[PDB]
Amino acid sequence: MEVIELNKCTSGQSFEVILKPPSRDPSLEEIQKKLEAAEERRKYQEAELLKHLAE
Amino acid sequence: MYTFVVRDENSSVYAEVSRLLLATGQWKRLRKDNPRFNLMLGERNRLPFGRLGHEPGLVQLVNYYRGADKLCRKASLVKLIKTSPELSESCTWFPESYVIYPTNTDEREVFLAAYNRRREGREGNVWIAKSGILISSEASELLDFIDEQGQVHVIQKYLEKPLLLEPGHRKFDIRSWVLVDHLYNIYLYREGVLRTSSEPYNSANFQDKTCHLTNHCIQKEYNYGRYEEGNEMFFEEFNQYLMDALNTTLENSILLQIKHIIRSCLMCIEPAISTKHLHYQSFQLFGFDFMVDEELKVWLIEVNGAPACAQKLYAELCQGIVDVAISSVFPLADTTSIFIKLHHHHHH
Amino acid sequence: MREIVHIQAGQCGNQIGAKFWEVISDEHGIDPTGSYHGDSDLQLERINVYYNEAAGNKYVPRAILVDLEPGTMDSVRSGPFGQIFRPDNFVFGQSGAGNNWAKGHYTEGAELVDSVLDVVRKESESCDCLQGFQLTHSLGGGTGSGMGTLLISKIREEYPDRIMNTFSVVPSPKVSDTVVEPYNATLSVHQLVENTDETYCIDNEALYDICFRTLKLTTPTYGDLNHLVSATMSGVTTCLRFPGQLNADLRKLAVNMVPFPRLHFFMPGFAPLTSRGSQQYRALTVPELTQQMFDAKNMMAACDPRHGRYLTVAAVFRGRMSMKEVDEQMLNVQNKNSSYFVEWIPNNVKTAVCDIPPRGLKMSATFIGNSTAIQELFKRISEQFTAMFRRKAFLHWYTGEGMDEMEFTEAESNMNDLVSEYQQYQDATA
Amino acid sequence: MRECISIHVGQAGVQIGNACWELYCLEHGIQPDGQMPSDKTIGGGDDSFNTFFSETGAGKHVPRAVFVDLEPTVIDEVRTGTYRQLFHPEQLITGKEDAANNYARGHYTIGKEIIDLVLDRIRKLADQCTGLQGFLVFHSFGGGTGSGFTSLLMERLSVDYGKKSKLEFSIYPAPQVSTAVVEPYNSILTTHTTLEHSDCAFMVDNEAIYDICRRNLDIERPTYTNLNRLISQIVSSITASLRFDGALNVDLTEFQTNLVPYPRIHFPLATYAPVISAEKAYHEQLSVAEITNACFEPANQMVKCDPRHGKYMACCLLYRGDVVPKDVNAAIATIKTKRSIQFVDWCPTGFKVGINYQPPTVVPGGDLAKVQRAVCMLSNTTAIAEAWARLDHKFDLMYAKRAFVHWYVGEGMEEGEFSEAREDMAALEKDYEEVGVDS
Ligand SMILES: CC[C@@H](C)[C@@H](NC(=O)[C@@H]1CCCCN1C)C(=O)N(C)[C@H](C[C@@H](OC(C)=O)c1nc(C(=O)N[C@@H](Cc2ccccc2)C[C@@H](C)C(=O)O)cs1)C(C)C
Ligand SMILES: Nc1nc2c(ncn2[C@@H]2O[C@H](COP(=O)(O)OP(=O)(O)OP(=O)(O)O)[C@@H](O)[C@H]2O)c(=O)[nH]1
Ligand SMILES: Nc1ncnc2c1ncn2[C@@H]1O[C@H](COP(=O)(O)OP(=O)(O)CP(=O)(O)O)[C@@H](O)[C@H]1O
Ligand SMILES: Nc1nc2c(ncn2[C@@H]2O[C@H](COP(=O)(O)OP(=O)(O)O)[C@@H](O)[C@H]2O)c(=O)[nH]1
Ligand SMILES: [Ca+2]
Ligand SMILES: [Mg+2]
Ligand SMILES: [Mg+2]
């Protein structure tokens, strides 16, 4: 029913039509910690494996 | 070999339908959570439509229409009739009705305004409430009953002058069963049922309700069974009564209006619920409940999205469902109609 | 690309291994001298997975040949493809293990294993990105079984983060009358459950029944059995050897196939089943391949698939055919049999097509299934094992090499636990 | 003129990236050698296409793109394909061994060891920028690199350029072309980690795209090349306003403003029409009313779901071709009387509209016919939560038996990261439901 913000150029145009109106991200430091806790867990699993195998 | 799962244990209707399908030899029942089915007989609540129609190489079909609740819940029905042009607040066949939330889009102001307008013509001022019912002539015995319950209510004009069967001065309601298949064909099962009251109708006594309320149960609990088995009259006998007592037919005096109400309801929501362009298809059985007044004018009371049948009628209907709802989509191996198909294209 | 090192151990391991090399060499147009002579470049794209490149444009299989006796190795040196293997890659002893797993694992195998490991090391070091290892051997003898599993344990120690893959031939009294094979097999399975990532179970009982009942061979030889083995091996390694999307390396394969670390034992399958020489005039249709490859009669492990459930399945179709049709036929198999596939691993069947068919066929299909019905094979070994072990029969051959009974009770227990883990998942619901 | 950096991660991200940049070169008249005859200022410019392309003194137009995969195969295609001279060696980043379909291995194990080199190469591109808007990131939900590495990158982008916008284009997994049974896991994991870091995310369900190709392009069995060509048309419609003169969605902030009121609910539904086979012998050109109407057909959406059962928060229409407003408005009036289009109570029921007069370019010898007008619609509707419910259920099925979990735990990841990611998704499904239904 109602056109607004009509903008035209050589490339084309744009506008808006209304029909009805209306009724803290991780620090570099934390990212490093969780990468490293992870690698600590990998390395521990693997060193346990190497233990059992030595047995 | 087609496959189906069963997710509503209670449904009398669908128990019978699996029975029929298994017994065909050409269907197999999988378990609940196996997604590799052609047919889901779904649960009544939070049915997972978002998960249907994402299994490559299976045409999938379910026995509910998503969005059909808008017809089947009492407050929803009222909003729907008030707000669709197609139906309007000038709908002649739905009781004047109002949505009333507790306080403990509300329409209490607008309601009272219409009630305190009807105290004036000093015309009958009986109203009824459900979501646990209450009929009363008093504005604030009703509003007082609702506020005293944490459930949302409909307050609807009560039909003071019903049509009474004889002998017995009895009230009734009519149940019609309607099957909408995946193409949005509307099918009225040719057998409906009257659910009769048993105690004489009381033009001025509202406490006792074996006489004001025609539920097959609330009648089993109080003279029950006297004039017909289980307080259920069928169309044969009721037609004869119309011929004998009123010189008319069920077809002409009542069924026409019923067909028009059914079609108007379902045509109204067809854009909202049709599965025509969808990755899964639906069908669904509805039960429409009607009141007839003493002028033989039909009124819609309610629509039930999970109706049960009447004992006598199970076998035939279920076979009908298998035939027009299911085998239309999944053909069986090879080599009367119980439904009236509702269609009307008037040109203007 | 990503290199695989192949080790073959013992008579069986070396027979089936040789046979694999012949077959995939021909699939890649590499001839007995190491010279390429084919007409596609699909053949060369992923050649480095299995072949090193020598100067002179020569391909040497990345393969190590091991046995405790000379026999099968003079025999392989002078097979058709014998001249293709690198010569310092033949590692052999002199006395043989006498069908004794203790000798293979602990006493004689002990002596030779450091020489094998040096050859393995040398082959590793010259790899750009090693994926890991694959071993062919039987479980019922002494070298493939006891030494082969000692190897696995040593390779795992030096390379704890590479994939270890075996082709393990399971013994059957239809093929062999040596009484202690259930002892060697149970001890071996114990090792396999701990130290491999995928194991393909090739069951001598299955191969023999296929040969007898289906291929109508009244007196099958090992050569007949091995013909089914090498078709299978070619089939299951297709995805590793050609360009493609699905299971294209060992680790991708293991993540698609192994939901729990212990249940890594697979039933391979194959269609069409054929006998050597005798001729294949009619190509199968995509619907025939599909029905046949899931047939119990086409499985290289004698398990009844209807007795269990598939946890995961990989399917490979070869030769030029309609991908559309492959797709319907695969969906059709799962939809028509949905209850054999666990509902709690959604979409657990994966399909590959490769354009190059195997020699002498316009088309085939290979199946790889992780089914709970594989418990049946372990149950059969376990019943044979327990009948002897409860009286300690034949044990003296094992304790005479220093083993203790306890070691036997442990192997038996680990295997009984394996069987019950499969049973637990056959009954799990969702 | 403010610049955008495009980051393509994984096989999916990289191959889709190729398709996009190819389409871009066709669109702007840039040749494979990187020369653009029609560009008048040699060695620079602050034109619109320069948001995506930098210039060298030799007159070469180079994508502000970085491709990273953890194995070399795919990126080696780029290094040596028809577009090989377009891209600077240092923009193409390969590892040796990939994440084996495992989010944990892509995030923790190989991620840990490559993030810095990737960040530094982007930093290189950011340094060539007068006023960087932010990032467009392309990746699958399902592979290990696309899920695990991407989420790690996003975390790090938020540290290093906290002020910047990040838009994602994410491939949602479909069994008919998936390569791994653990995609649902990877998908929930990457979504829980990236949710806070992404300003607006465009999901493309491979299944929707696969079916559109079968039905509309009459293709037997689509390959990635088919899917990617179709996906690139849609991406191109979405980014056209960054690359050409206009006044709608001209910066990345504006995508968020126009499409995302609620920052967690930032997954708009894309629908595109018409899709017409190049083989089609004869074809009647479809009117504005027709292609606009096709924008409400679930069969033309990038994610199958039913917007009739949900609420809209926002809705943009982006036309390419012969289209005037008088036609758009009349189309909208009709459509609205015919269809179920409910907005949430706190938004105007309306439409932002952008028309670019050039109709869509097609790759010559492609499957897509040249058309006079096309439309991509971008709506933010709560119906798209259907996709999360489908993924969540597959996750619950497998997780309850801990199937494959050991592969994740084995890379360092902890079993609690599973249930945490799952709970995040549960609260996200609650958000959509709260926003989109009353009864
Ligand atoms: C004296 C009886 C054995 C020959 C025989 N029987 C048995 O072992 C007993 C007999 C009574 C109780 C239950 N059964 C199990 C047998 O058929 N065996 C062991 C074969 C294996 C055997 O068969 C024959 C007929 O020679 C062998 N096959 C080969 C063989 O394939 N040798 C090839 C070379 C070769 C290959 C692999 C291993 C060794 C040698 C040579 C060529 C011609 C070929 O390829 O067919 C050698 S011994 C099958 C059960 C598999
Ligand atoms: N549309 C499209 N989808 C793709 C393409 N390549 C892969 N996919 C899908 O993305 C998921 C697989 O992810 P990939 O991108 O191949 O994985 P990756 O990021 O390379 O990670 P790795 O596990 O390291 O290989 C599956 O859902 C594939 O179907 C592509 O070119 N186009
Ligand atoms: N406006 C009205 N006028 C007269 N009677 C009415 C009425 N509304 C309801 N009733 C009576 O109440 C009975 C049941 O009410 P209603 O059907 O609305 O509740 P309900 O859904 O729990 C039982 P059912 O599902 O069988 O219809 C009807 O059979 C009818 O007799
Ligand atoms: N299928 C097959 N089975 C074999 C072959 N050679 C031996 N076997 C079986 O392998 C077991 C004995 O193992 P073998 O490899 O000979 O002993 P090893 O040299 O000590 O490893 C018995 O079950 C044999 O039947 C063969 O070439 N093919
Ligand atoms: Ca310029
Ligand atoms: Mg031997
Ligand atoms: Mg990859």
Side-chain angles (χ1 to χ4, degrees):
Chain A
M1 302 262 152
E2 193 210 357
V3 170
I4 78 164
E5 317 257 327
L6 183 52
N7 256 97
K8 322 167 84 179
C9 68
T10 289
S11 292
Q13 56 202 282
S14 75
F15 57 97
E16 173 166 13
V17 22
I18 321 282
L19 306 183
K20 268 100 83 48
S23 348
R24 325 136 37 270
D25 290 344
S27 69
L28 180 32
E29 208 232 69
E30 296 144 59
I31 294 160
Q32 292 305 347
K33 269 173 164 283
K34 68 109 180 219
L35 291 195
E36 276 167 337
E39 181 181 52
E40 298 321 77
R41 277 180 316 251
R42 267 192 313 285
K43 284 174 179 175
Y44 170 87
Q45 284 145 33
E46 165 156 308
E48 288 296 87
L49 179 81
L50 285 189
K51 258 257 182 225
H52 286 43
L53 286 167
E55 268 170 343
Chain B
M1 180 75 65
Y2 303 120
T3 55
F4 71 96
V5 290
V6 169
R7 300 170 50 109
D8 190 356
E9 280 290 284
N10 308 344
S11 153
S12 16
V13 167
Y14 286 101
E16 181 66 10
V17 168
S18 27
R19 257 208 19 72
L20 289 181
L21 287 174
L22 292 162
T24 58
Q26 312 170 69
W27 275 86
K28 285 318 202 72
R29 176 168 166 170
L30 320 174
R31 187 42 40 155
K32 253 116 91 35
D33 299 39
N34 188 347
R36 317 182 81 111
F37 57 84
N38 293 110
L39 169 68
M40 163 167 168
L41 309 176
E43 60 264 53
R44 289 181 51 184
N45 270 214
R46 330 199 73 265
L47 193 152
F49 293 99
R51 303 204 316 267
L52 296 163
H54 305 279
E55 289 287 355
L58 280 172
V59 169
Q60 289 191 318
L61 177 68
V62 57
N63 73 341
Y64 284 86
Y65 266 97
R66 189 177 188 194
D69 46 274
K70 263 168 191 168
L71 204 63
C72 291
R73 310 295 176 258
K74 312 207 138 75
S76 271
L77 190 55
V78 181
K79 281 164 221 156
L80 185 61
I81 288 155
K82 299 209 186 210
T83 73
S84 331
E86 264 162 295
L87 267 22
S88 84
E89 53 315 318
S90 307
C91 181
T92 71
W93 48 250
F94 186 72
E96 160 165 33
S97 292
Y98 295 106
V99 180
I100 304 297
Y101 304 88
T103 56
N104 57 358
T105 65
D106 186 72
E107 48 196 356
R108 216 185 301 234
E109 313 128 292
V110 153
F111 159 52
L112 296 162
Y115 174 106
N116 293 335
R117 198 196 300 113
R118 277 170 43 83
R119 211 160 216 198
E120 310 288 67
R122 263 166 247 106
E123 45 207 333
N125 227 355
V126 201
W127 295 79
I128 182 169
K130 197 204 183 271
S131 17
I133 290 183
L134 191 74
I135 326 166
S136 142
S137 189
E138 286 277 285
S140 15
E141 273 174 64
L142 296 150
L143 286 174
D144 282 29
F145 181 43
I146 282 163
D147 273 21
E148 211 92 3
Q149 229 141 359
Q151 178 57 351
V152 195
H153 275 61
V154 181
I155 179 75
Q156 157 175 115
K157 175 89 203 75
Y158 187 79
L159 309 163
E160 276 175 43
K161 16 194 89 211
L163 180 74
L164 310 152
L165 312 164
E166 307 295 0
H169 214 58
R170 286 135 74 203
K171 159 139 155 174
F172 64 95
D173 83 350
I174 304 192
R175 148 71 51 96
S176 322
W177 289 282
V178 184
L179 179 64
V180 177
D181 76 3
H182 69 287
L183 290 166
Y184 224 83
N185 293 321
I186 308 174
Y187 298 104
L188 178 59
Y189 182 30
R190 65 183 183 206
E191 315 292 337
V193 73
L194 288 87
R195 291 177 297 185
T196 59
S197 174
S198 204
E199 269 95 301
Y201 179 86
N202 221 116
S203 291
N205 164 226
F206 298 132
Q207 272 309 245
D208 159 68
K209 295 183 290 185
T210 318
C211 94
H212 288 277
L213 301 178
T214 62
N215 320 62
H216 187 287
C217 70
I218 272 145
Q219 294 287 301
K220 179 93 68 67
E221 212 183 51
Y222 309 86
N223 221 9
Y224 173 103
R226 194 128 97 69
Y227 317 87
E228 64 281 316
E229 196 187 343
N231 283 187
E232 285 187 334
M233 187 180 315
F234 300 86
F235 270 14
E236 182 86 351
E237 196 210 313
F238 181 53
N239 183 58
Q240 203 54 62
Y241 173 80
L242 282 158
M243 284 191 295
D244 296 343
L246 275 147
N247 191 32
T248 194
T249 64
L250 178 40
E251 194 64 61
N252 297 2
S253 66
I254 283 165
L255 230 36
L256 275 178
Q257 279 162 101
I258 289 177
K259 293 165 157 155
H260 169 74
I261 299 162
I262 297 173
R263 276 213 312 107
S264 314
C265 283
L266 295 176
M267 276 339 173
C268 186
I269 55 159
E270 166 182 39
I273 72 178
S274 174
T275 60
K276 230 266 205 188
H277 286 302
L278 261 206
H279 38 293
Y280 69 95
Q281 300 292 298
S282 307
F283 68 83
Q284 179 178 353
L285 180 78
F286 296 85
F288 275 78
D289 301 336
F290 312 90
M291 202 83 231
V292 184
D293 81 9
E294 49 165 39
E295 254 108 62
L296 290 178
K297 194 251 172 92
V298 174
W299 298 83
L300 179 59
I301 306 322
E302 84 142 325
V303 193
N304 307 89
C309 210
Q311 293 314 311
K312 192 208 168 190
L313 298 178
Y314 280 94
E316 191 174 33
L317 185 55
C318 299
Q319 189 53 29
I321 299 167
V322 170
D323 281 324
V324 333
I326 301 173
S327 307
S328 55
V329 172
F330 312 105
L332 294 176
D334 85 321
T335 162
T336 332
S337 187
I338 66 145
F339 300 105
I340 308 153
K341 162 179 175 140
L342 316 182
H343 51 74
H344 203 259
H345 201 260
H346 182 243
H347 289 233
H348 53 79
Chain C
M1 318 196 339
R2 311 271 314 283
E3 303 95 326
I4 292 171
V5 177
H6 166 109
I7 311 140
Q8 52 186 67
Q11 165 175 106
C12 184
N14 278 287
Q15 288 286 166
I16 64 170
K19 203 64 176 10
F20 171 73
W21 289 101
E22 264 159 69
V23 168
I24 73 155
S25 289
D26 174 282
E27 274 181 20
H28 285 251
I30 316 289
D31 75 359
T33 67
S35 287
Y36 173 66
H37 286 301
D39 46 24
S40 193
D41 276 273
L42 256 36
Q43 301 183 308
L44 293 197
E45 179 123 314
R46 305 186 70 196
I47 193 79
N48 296 310
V49 174
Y50 279 112
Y51 303 80
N52 280 320
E53 227 160 312
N57 282 293
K58 304 311 266 289
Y59 294 94
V60 191
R62 197 183 299 94
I64 309 187
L65 302 78
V66 182
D67 206 341
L68 282 164
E69 72 198 350
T72 307
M73 279 164 47
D74 299 58
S75 164
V76 160
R77 197 146 15 217
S78 223
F81 274 73
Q83 283 207 177
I84 206 188
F85 299 111
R86 179 161 159 72
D88 335 38
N89 269 27
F90 286 78
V91 188
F92 63 88
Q94 286 292 337
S95 55
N99 296 314
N100 189 325
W101 189 94
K103 284 191 197 175
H105 200 82
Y106 286 131
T107 61
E108 324 276 319
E111 259 230 20
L112 181 86
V113 70
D114 284 8
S115 345
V116 179
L117 286 161
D118 295 328
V119 172
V120 169
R121 210 168 274 116
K122 182 153 168 66
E123 284 284 10
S124 294
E125 292 181 332
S126 91
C127 278
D128 207 55
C129 189
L130 176 65
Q131 5 180 359
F133 300 95
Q134 85 178 29
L135 179 87
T136 48
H137 60 149
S138 63
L139 295 190
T143 295
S145 213
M147 201 191 172
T149 57
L150 180 68
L151 265 156
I152 280 172
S153 193
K154 281 179 131 85
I155 286 174
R156 184 174 189 200
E157 188 174 40
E158 229 192 320
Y159 300 97
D161 57 341
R162 310 287 96 232
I163 288 304
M164 168 77 71
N165 184 105
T166 69
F167 287 88
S168 295
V169 184
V170 183
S172 154
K174 289 181 167 147
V175 166
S176 183
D177 299 275
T178 132
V179 74
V180 297
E181 285 178 6
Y183 282 167
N184 307 331
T186 292
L187 289 157
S188 275
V189 160
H190 189 28
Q191 298 292 312
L192 289 185
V193 173
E194 310 298 350
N195 290 325
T196 71
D197 293 300
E198 306 126 338
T199 281
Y200 295 99
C201 310
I202 304 156
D203 188 5
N204 265 354
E205 190 138 322
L207 313 179
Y208 178 93
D209 299 330
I210 289 160
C211 280
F212 184 84
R213 304 190 200 147
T214 290
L215 263 15
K216 290 337 220 295
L217 298 177
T218 45
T219 301
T221 74
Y222 278 135
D224 296 314
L225 271 40
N226 285 359
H227 174 65
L228 301 173
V229 185
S230 65
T232 298
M233 285 181 77
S234 157
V236 311
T237 58
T238 291
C239 288
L240 314 172
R241 288 188 289 115
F242 301 98
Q245 276 307 296
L246 166 81
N247 299 323
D249 79 78
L250 297 174
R251 191 169 275 102
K252 284 184 157 168
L253 183 45
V255 189
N256 277 332
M257 298 301 286
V258 186
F260 311 96
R262 286 159 61 83
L263 319 182
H264 56 262
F265 296 88
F266 301 154
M267 282 172 76
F270 189 83
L273 296 161
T274 69
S275 54
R276 258 171 320 167
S278 111
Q279 261 309 328
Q280 275 301 114
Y281 298 132
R282 195 204 153 289
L284 268 64
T285 69
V286 169
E288 286 165 331
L289 284 171
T290 297
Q291 179 279 311
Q292 277 166 56
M293 77 192 296
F294 286 79
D295 213 305
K297 307 200 297 249
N298 292 244
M299 306 294 157
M300 313 299 153
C303 302
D304 191 339
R306 317 203 99 126
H307 282 171
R309 309 190 77 204
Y310 291 116
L311 309 172
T312 59
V313 177
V316 194
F317 290 81
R318 292 183 81 162
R320 217 171 340 105
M321 61 184 87
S322 169
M323 270 206 219
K324 170 179 195 265
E325 213 190 355
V326 169
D327 296 351
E328 309 166 309
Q329 282 313 307
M330 287 304 278
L331 287 165
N332 163 55
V333 144
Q334 308 167 63
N335 289 328
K336 287 322 180 93
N337 296 295
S338 76
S339 81
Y340 297 109
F341 294 93
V342 298
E343 65 291 12
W344 45 268
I345 302 165
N347 308 109
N348 64 342
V349 183
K350 296 322 221 224
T351 290
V353 182
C354 162
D355 309 286
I356 315 292
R359 162 121 301 152
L361 289 177
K362 289 286 183 230
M363 42 197 52
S364 44
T366 309
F367 163 101
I368 304 173
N370 188 343
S371 161
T372 61
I374 197 91
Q375 76 173 301
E376 293 185 333
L377 173 60
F378 293 117
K379 273 200 262 171
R380 184 188 90 213
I381 304 307
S382 183
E383 277 143 43
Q384 293 157 0
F385 174 101
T386 291
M388 286 183 297
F389 196 62
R390 68 204 231 271
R391 301 287 288 263
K392 303 176 177 183
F394 306 100
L395 229 53
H396 75 92
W397 297 115
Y398 293 86
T399 69
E401 300 308 305
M403 292 186 60
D404 193 84
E405 294 180 16
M406 257 182 198
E407 199 159 338
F408 275 74
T409 294
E410 281 173 17
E412 182 185 52
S413 272
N414 194 21
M415 189 162 86
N416 294 332
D417 286 347
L418 181 77
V419 159
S420 67
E421 298 157 38
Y422 280 120
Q423 190 68 37
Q424 184 214 318
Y425 298 115
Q426 181 163 297
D427 299 326
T429 47
Chain D
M1 184 291 276
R2 306 199 71 203
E3 302 91 342
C4 292
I5 291 157
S6 265
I7 304 166
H8 313 269
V9 182
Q11 193 182 266
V14 166
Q15 295 192 148
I16 284 161
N18 278 123
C20 287
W21 289 101
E22 166 182 66
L23 189 47
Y24 295 172
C25 298
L26 295 171
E27 274 171 25
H28 291 279
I30 301 168
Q31 297 151 347
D33 43 278
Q35 287 306 293
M36 188 183 168
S38 87
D39 174 11
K40 289 313 162 187
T41 60
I42 298 356
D46 48 17
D47 291 307
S48 254
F49 69 74
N50 291 122
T51 56
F52 273 60
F53 284 98
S54 60
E55 297 183 43
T56 71
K60 178 192 277 197
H61 299 85
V62 7
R64 303 178 200 273
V66 24
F67 301 68
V68 57
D69 201 1
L70 301 186
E71 64 99 333
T73 263
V74 188
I75 278 164
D76 282 343
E77 244 57 67
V78 195
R79 300 202 167 97
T80 65
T82 118
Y83 280 104
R84 70 190 168 277
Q85 276 165 98
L86 210 59
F87 292 108
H88 193 292
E90 271 169 348
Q91 280 160 248
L92 310 183
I93 307 161
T94 48
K96 261 178 186 270
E97 70 192 296
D98 77 31
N101 289 327
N102 177 339
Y103 167 96
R105 187 164 170 98
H107 192 79
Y108 300 96
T109 304
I110 299 151
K112 196 198 182 281
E113 90 168 80
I114 210 194
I115 187 39
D116 282 312
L117 164 55
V118 158
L119 281 175
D120 124 305
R121 294 281 175 91
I122 286 160
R123 190 46 84 184
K124 250 209 185 43
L125 280 188
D127 284 358
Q128 297 323 117
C129 288
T130 60
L132 186 70
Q133 259 166 97
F135 298 100
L136 311 190
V137 187
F138 294 77
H139 69 102
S140 58
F141 268 181
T145 303
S147 55
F149 187 63
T150 302
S151 76
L152 178 63
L153 183 49
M154 296 292 287
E155 279 192 315
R156 273 289 279 277
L157 292 184
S158 279
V159 152
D160 289 36
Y161 309 80
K163 277 17 270 232
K164 276 25 158 59
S165 267
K166 330 213 249 316
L167 261 61
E168 303 176 75
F169 294 88
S170 293
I171 302 314
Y172 174 113
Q176 65 225 117
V177 294
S178 100
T179 36
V181 0
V182 289
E183 308 205 61
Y185 281 169
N186 295 347
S187 295
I188 288 4
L189 294 165
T190 197
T191 301
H192 162 70
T193 305
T194 296
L195 208 54
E196 299 296 270
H197 304 274
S198 164
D199 302 294
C200 179
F202 299 102
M203 276 186 308
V204 174
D205 190 344
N206 262 347
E207 167 212 73
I209 298 306
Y210 193 88
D211 289 317
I212 284 165
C213 284
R214 272 159 99 202
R215 285 182 301 99
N216 297 334
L217 290 190
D218 320 297
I219 291 173
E220 286 290 60
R221 207 278 183 202
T223 60
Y224 286 148
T225 301
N226 301 119
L227 310 182
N228 291 340
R229 274 155 169 187
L230 178 59
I231 280 151
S232 65
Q233 288 292 318
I234 293 130
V235 165
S236 163
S237 300
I238 295 168
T239 71
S241 69
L242 306 167
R243 293 182 286 117
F244 301 96
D245 185 21
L248 176 67
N249 291 337
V250 295
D251 73 16
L252 307 180
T253 304
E254 210 190 308
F255 281 87
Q256 180 280 283
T257 304
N258 292 327
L259 287 164
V260 189
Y262 253 86
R264 275 170 64 80
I265 292 144
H266 67 232
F267 291 91
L269 188 49
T271 308
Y272 183 87
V275 171
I276 284 321
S277 165
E279 255 46 64
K280 227 194 192 191
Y282 280 110
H283 169 72
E284 312 172 332
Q285 295 305 117
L286 286 165
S287 72
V288 167
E290 293 166 310
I291 69 178
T292 310
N293 203 41
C295 283
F296 303 77
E297 282 312 323
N300 304 141
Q301 290 160 195
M302 305 308 112
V303 173
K304 280 157 168 150
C305 65
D306 189 4
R308 295 174 302 178
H309 295 102
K311 278 174 169 34
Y312 284 89
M313 283 144 276
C315 188
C316 272
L317 299 158
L318 309 168
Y319 297 86
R320 298 179 96 161
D322 185 22
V323 171
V324 284
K326 138 203 208 166
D327 294 315
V328 171
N329 306 327
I332 289 165
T334 293
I335 280 161
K336 176 55 199 182
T337 85
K338 259 60 201 296
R339 282 198 199 266
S340 349
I341 295 164
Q342 253 280 306
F343 278 69
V344 296
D345 292 337
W346 41 281
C347 298
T349 307
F351 295 85
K352 294 234 177 40
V353 172
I355 300 169
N356 176 287
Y357 297 140
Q358 216 169 297
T361 302
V362 286
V363 181
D367 308 298
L368 264 137
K370 142 84 206 220
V371 297
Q372 301 265 248
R373 58 180 79 70
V375 61
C376 173
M377 187 173 70
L378 292 189
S379 51
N380 193 337
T381 165
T382 58
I384 202 171
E386 285 180 33
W388 299 129
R390 290 154 49 213
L391 217 48
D392 279 348
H393 179 74
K394 290 178 193 271
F395 182 112
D396 297 343
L397 282 178
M398 263 186 310
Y399 195 63
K401 311 261 187 301
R402 292 307 182 279
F404 303 92
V405 166
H406 73 277
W407 284 106
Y408 288 75
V409 165
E411 293 289 358
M413 172 153 147
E414 302 201 83
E415 175 147 338
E417 177 156 5
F418 281 80
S419 44
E420 216 187 283
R422 184 53 179 97
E423 264 150 0
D424 205 4
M425 296 304 291
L428 187 77
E429 293 187 73
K430 290 281 94 202
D431 299 340
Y432 277 94
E433 202 188 58
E434 214 160 293
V435 167
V437 348
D438 327 290
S439 299

